[PDB]
Amino acid sequence: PVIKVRENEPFDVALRRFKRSCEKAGVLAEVRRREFYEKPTTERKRAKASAVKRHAKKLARENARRTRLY
Amino acid sequence: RKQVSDGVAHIHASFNNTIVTITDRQGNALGWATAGGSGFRGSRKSTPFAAQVAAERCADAVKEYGIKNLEVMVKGPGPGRESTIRALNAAGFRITNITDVTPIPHNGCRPPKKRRV
Amino acid sequence: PRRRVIGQRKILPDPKFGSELLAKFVNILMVDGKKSTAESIVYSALETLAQRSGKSELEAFEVALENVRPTVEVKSRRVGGSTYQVPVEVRPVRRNALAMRWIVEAARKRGDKSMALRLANELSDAAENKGTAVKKREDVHRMAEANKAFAHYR
RNA sequence: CUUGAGUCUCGUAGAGGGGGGUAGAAUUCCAGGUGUAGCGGUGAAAUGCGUAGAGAUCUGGAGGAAUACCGGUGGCGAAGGCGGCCCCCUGGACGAAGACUGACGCUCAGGUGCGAAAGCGUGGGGAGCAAACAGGAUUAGAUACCCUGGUAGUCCACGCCGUAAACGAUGUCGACUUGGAGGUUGUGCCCUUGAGGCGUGGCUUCCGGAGCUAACGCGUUAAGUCGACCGCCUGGGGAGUACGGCCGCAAGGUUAAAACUCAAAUGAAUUGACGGGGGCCCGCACAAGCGGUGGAGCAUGUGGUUUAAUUCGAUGCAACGCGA
Ligand SMILES: [Mg+2]
Ligand SMILES: [Mg+2]
Ligand SMILES: [Mg+2]
Ligand SMILES: [Mg+2]
Ligand SMILES: [Mg+2]
Ligand SMILES: [Mg+2]
Ligand SMILES: [Mg+2]
Ligand SMILES: [Mg+2]
Ligand SMILES: [Mg+2]
Ligand SMILES: [Mg+2]
Ligand SMILES: [Mg+2]
Ligand SMILES: [Mg+2]
Ligand SMILES: [Mg+2]
Ligand SMILES: [Mg+2]
Ligand SMILES: [Mg+2]
Ligand SMILES: [Mg+2]
Ligand SMILES: [Mg+2]
Ligand SMILES: [Mg+2]
Ligand SMILES: [Mg+2]
Ligand SMILES: [Mg+2]
Ligand SMILES: [Mg+2]
Ligand SMILES: [Mg+2]
Ligand SMILES: [Mg+2]
Known part of the structure; x- marks a missing residue:
């Protein structure tokens, strides 16, 4: 996440760009995940859970949440 | 005794501690400071505020060298990662470039085992 | 609640003197619902203080308050299972109330004979900034400074 | 005879397998520069490392292992499994049109092969991690969880072992039976007018009808309707154990009982209760405050002890100035 502060760019603005760049890159997330060894089985299981939850939630929202709530 | 005007601020921001190190553009270190040496231990040195005061201390230390421009290289996942740069700017350097140099492997060495807490 | x-x-x-702040001080001072006694004590203390230190009763009283109010106190935020002493800025009504409370407690402690005398001495000390209530405020501030790392991470 | 089964022609996608090179990032170590008192770690510490100059930072070098992003309920494989890039050898699947053989097929007890990880033998290698082990914490203890270290092992070659919740807890092969939304990979036509319209194959994910099921659920990839063959079960424990056999260097694997003992053991779902589950909410529940009790004397009640009797009852909150 390289940033160079442009001419007449405020510092706060520069900081904002830097943070955005880092978030987009996903550096913190990568480091956190690589902090400890996740077993392959654990990684697979987590992936499966994420996929299932995401799919179920999407289905519930779009199709199940098409009714009169009140 | 020497003057350089333009330095690099290497902000090593681990979870436990923040190390700030001002250096010449080549790599040679001028002054450093940590939250530990800044007077914070444990829960207090693992905070953004501690990082900020460490940064202030570092700036004071390298005041002899008369550094005016400064590019900051942030490393690691840390509570500071922002406080240090804010503090440095307040201490009054022109921040020119801000770069992240956190070392991610390309699936290399095995990490240590997961903590059971 | x-x-x-x-x-x-x-x-x-x-x-x-028609003062709400003074009334509050009297209330804090009072014990056992004995307001008359409390007001007599407060007035005696004020009169002595005015004579000793200067201008008026209310101005002297205010000066003492200014030297004994705390800007910041600490609370114990208990979120991560352990308790962080966090600093927090003390709002004005609390600042007056807390200062008054501290002053009355210090006066009660103090070794002079009459209550009025103790109160007058304590107030004068506060005005000078070498007394015990003031010491209490200082202690509170010291703690806040120590725990400044936990200020805006509640 | 050609519809099952196979052969040939042309393409397609693929972490399918075996061998050999190579790339960059990162960790470790080594040497050197800068530089100075901390670093590391945790809930908090300490062990550990550092003024014999560490950690930080730049340069160079060594070496091992693994391939970020792409990356996907994506793909390939009989399963186990397979993930940087390049080459060499190599197996299968699928589609298109035809041509060919002419039931050549399905299943399979014994048998044979393949078979994660750990483990074993011999010879290498060894960065990181890490059983064992050591020290520091925590604790009533802590032969654990946490921390700092750390050896087999993890890697390579070649042998062995032969097991896993080796799971879809679902044997293989074939036929038939309403649908919807996707993914992936072919292919025919439509002007691809654009990413696009209508088909037709393969594999694949979810939802759901009839039907089935104890229910949960399954539902054209069946747990539906059927046919062929195999494997396996017959209450819980004893027990996948003993003995015998076979196999193995060993660890052990495989085959596999009996006495004795009980009237249960189990599956799914229901209503509660409970959770050091989750969401929302209240109450002097906490918080903010004020005043007490626990110390003293005395009043009173209780326990106890004493007594001839110390009447009987109340005795976690919700008995103890209570019946009185
Ligand atoms: Mg760790
Ligand atoms: Mg391939
Ligand atoms: Mg295939
Ligand atoms: Mg057999
Ligand atoms: Mg192995
Ligand atoms: Mg070996
Ligand atoms: Mg060996
Ligand atoms: Mg280790
Ligand atoms: Mg360990
Ligand atoms: Mg088995
Ligand atoms: Mg498996
Ligand atoms: Mg089985
Ligand atoms: Mg077969
Ligand atoms: Mg279904
Ligand atoms: Mg029996
Ligand atoms: Mg056996
Ligand atoms: Mg045997
Ligand atoms: Mg309270
Ligand atoms: Mg008492
Ligand atoms: Mg007593
Ligand atoms: Mg009692
Ligand atoms: Mg009685
Ligand atoms: Mg009784």
């Missing part, structure tokens, strides 16, 4: 933003209650101003 859980579900209450109750209205602050009405305190009448003291008859001699």
